[PDB]
């Protein structure tokens, strides 16, 4: 049964990321490792990442990054498959990637793909993001940080946080609807390859404004070649009061459809 990598059985080279700490290494080939880097966790904390690991393994599916395994021993880790290519945030924002208008619907496809997996899987992502979206050999949609939402608990998302989320209201925001309007924020990077509210240098400004709902993304920045009924739906997942906002089952019914009336 258990998914755990022995001492040794794993090579780690090169690093990468910077809530964990990521590595590129070898385990039956290339894979990603992102070992959690704490010190040494205490008994009952060991448990609690197993308790998450968990959650993970529920997982098993093209759109979702492949869960390969966990380590406790050299340190707390999580293996996953290594991708070939960049994060959605690095097409679009970083080398300006500029993508077909189809490319981007099936992106858009393939991310609700993963999501309404999650949801039927009743997980959370609770911070769903481009710079969290792979695009494997640039044609594959993979969902990743989403799992340890306990490990955390026990700043840089506030772009994608719907307005319930952002004003630290209550202590449980985050639902189904909460990763939805997450997603009609990658709906507008995709159709406006640029990150909303741009013209405001002040952060806080943002934070307070959005919570509120006095401001929200900008629709009339879209590509005037996507189509009629993304704009409706993208409006869709990005209603203030999170009742109005509809359910991957809904969004990809209606990704689905538009893009059945698009090549032509
Ligand atoms: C997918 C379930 C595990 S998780 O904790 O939700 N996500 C998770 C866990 C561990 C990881 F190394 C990663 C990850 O980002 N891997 C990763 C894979 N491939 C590349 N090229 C890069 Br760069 C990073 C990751 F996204």
Same mark, same amino acid.
């Given at each position: 049964? /258990?998914?755990?990598? !022995?001492?040794?059985? %794993?090579?780690? &080279?090169?690093?990468?990321?910077? $809530?964990? #700490?990521?590595?590129? =290494?070898?385990?039956?080939?290339?894979?990603?490792?992102?070992?959690? +880097?704490? #010190?040494?966790?205490?008994?009952?904390?060991?448990?609690?990442?197993? +308790?998450?690991?968990?959650?993970?393994?529920? #997982?098993?599916?093209?759109? %979702?990054?492949?869960?390969?395994?966990?380590?406790?021993? !050299?340190?707390?880790?999580?293996? #996953?498959?290594?991708?070939? &290519?960049?994060?959605?945030?690095?097409?679009?924002?970083?080398?300006?990637?500029? $993508?077909?208008?189809?490319?981007?619907?099936?992106?858009?496809?393939?991310?609700?793909?993963?999501? /309404?997996?999650?949801?039927?899987?009743?997980?959370?992502?609770? /911070?769903?993001?481009?710079?969290?979206? $792979?695009?494997?050999?640039?044609?594959?949609?993979?969902? =990743?940080? $989403?799992?340890?939402?306990?490990?955390?608990?026990?700043?840089?998302?506030?772009?994608?946080?719907?307005?319930?989320?952002?004003?630290?209201?209550?202590?449980?925001?985050?639902?189904?609807?909460? /990763?939805?309007?997450?997603?009609? %924020?990658?709906?507008?990077?995709?159709?406006?390859?640029?990150?909303?509210?741009? +013209?405001?240098?002040?952060?806080?400004?943002?934070?307070?404004?959005? =919570?509120?709902?006095?401001?929200?993304?900008?629709?009339?920045?879209?590509?005037?070649?996507?189509?009629?009924?993304?704009?409706?739906?993208?409006?869709?997942?990005?209603?203030?009061?999170?009742?109005?906002?509809?359910?991957?089952?809904?969004?990809?019914?209606? %990704?689905?459809?538009?893009?059945?009336?698009?090549?032509?």
């Amino acid at each position: 049964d /258990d998914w755990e990598i !022995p001492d040794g059985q %794993i090579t780690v &080279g090169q690093r990468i990321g910077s $809530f964990g #700490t990521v590595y590129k =290494g070898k385990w039956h080939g290339d894979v990603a490792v992102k070992m959690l +880097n704490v #010190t040494a966790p205490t008994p009952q904390q060991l448990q609690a990442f197993k +308790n998450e690991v968990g959650v993970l393994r529920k #997982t098993r599916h093209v759109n %979702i990054l492949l869960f390969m395994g966990y380590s406790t021993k !050299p340190q707390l880790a999580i293996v #996953t498959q290594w991708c070939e &290519g960049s994060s959605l945030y690095h097409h679009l924002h970083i080398i300006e990637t500029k $993508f077909e208008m189809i490319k981007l619907i099936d992106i858009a496809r393939q991310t609700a793909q993963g999501m /309404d997996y999650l949801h039927a899987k009743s997980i959370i992502h609770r /911070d769903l993001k481009s710079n969290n979206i $792979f695009l494997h050999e640039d044609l594959t949609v993979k969902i =990743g940080d $989403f799992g340890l939402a306990t490990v955390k608990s026990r700043s840089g998302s506030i772009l994608w946080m719907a307005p319930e989320v952002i004003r630290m209201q209550d202590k449980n925001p985050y639902s189904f609807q909460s /990763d939805v309007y997450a997603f009609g %924020i990658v709906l507008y990077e995709l159709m406006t390859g640029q990150l909303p509210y741009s +013209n405001i240098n002040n952060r806080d400004q943002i934070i307070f404004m959005v =919570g509120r709902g006095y401001l929200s993304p900008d629709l009339s920045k879209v590509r005037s070649n996507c189509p009629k009924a993304m704009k409706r739906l993208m409006a869709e997942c990005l209603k203030k009061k999170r009742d109005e906002r509809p359910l991957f089952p809904q969004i990809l019914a209606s %990704i689905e459809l538009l893009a059945r009336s698009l090549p032509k």
